[PDB]
Amino acid sequence: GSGCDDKCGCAVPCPGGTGCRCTSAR
Ligand SMILES: [Zn+2]
Ligand SMILES: [Zn+2]
Are the beta carbons of 11 and 20 closer than 8 angstroms? Predict the structure, then answer.
Protein backbone atom coordinates (compact mmCIF):
# COMPACT_ATOMS: atom_id res chain seq x y z
CA GLY A 1 0.00 0.00 0.00
CA SER A 2 1.43 3.39 1.19
CA GLY A 3 0.76 5.28 -2.11
CA CYS A 4 4.07 5.11 -4.10
CA ASP A 5 7.29 6.81 -5.21
CA ASP A 6 9.22 6.89 -8.54
CA LYS A 7 11.39 4.03 -7.13
CA CYS A 8 8.35 1.82 -7.91
CA GLY A 9 7.83 3.01 -11.54
CA CYS A 10 5.00 5.28 -10.53
CA ALA A 11 4.74 9.05 -10.33
CA VAL A 12 3.92 10.77 -7.02
CA PRO A 13 0.92 10.45 -6.81
CA CYS A 14 0.65 7.11 -8.72
CA PRO A 15 -0.80 7.56 -12.28
CA GLY A 16 -3.78 5.27 -11.57
CA GLY A 17 -4.74 3.20 -14.59
CA THR A 18 -2.42 5.20 -16.94
CA GLY A 19 0.53 2.75 -17.26
CA CYS A 20 0.67 1.86 -13.53
CA ARG A 21 2.98 -1.17 -13.11
CA CYS A 22 1.57 -2.18 -9.65
CA THR A 23 -1.35 -4.44 -10.76
CA SER A 24 -2.21 -7.60 -12.76
CA ALA A 25 -2.66 -5.97 -16.17
CA ARG A 26 0.12 -6.95 -18.64
ZN1 LIG B 1 3.95 1.29 -7.33
ZN1 LIG C 1 1.86 2.36 -9.05
Answer: no
